[PDB]
């Protein structure tokens, strides 16, 4: 039985993920650097399970796109409208 405050915190974390994704250019590997950015945006990653949960909620509701980058095996998340050029540029840059 989820208390309303907890649900509100989930929404706050989703807003943070969204704002950070816009700020960092709309494409990110799901890894420590990203979670650290979300933590710093919110004012401060010993947990991370909690934020990952909300990333997952966002992927499932299609607020974020997600896919495995096959060469590295890392998971990429992206703003759905960012464009494949940007995604590939990011993959190339972080190669």
Author numbering: 543 to 586, 589 to 639
Kindly provide excerpts from the paper associated with this entry.
Recruitment of Pol III to these genes requires the essential transcription factors TFIIIB and TFIIIC2. The six subunits of yeast TFIIIC are partitioned into two DNA-binding subcomplexes (τA and τB). The binding of these intragenic promoters by TFIIIC permits the assembly of TFIIIB, upstream of the transcription start site, which subsequently leads to the recruitment of Pol III, the formation of a PIC and finally to transcription. A genetic study suggests that the two largest TFIIIC subunits, τ138 and τ131, are responsible for connecting τA and τB16.
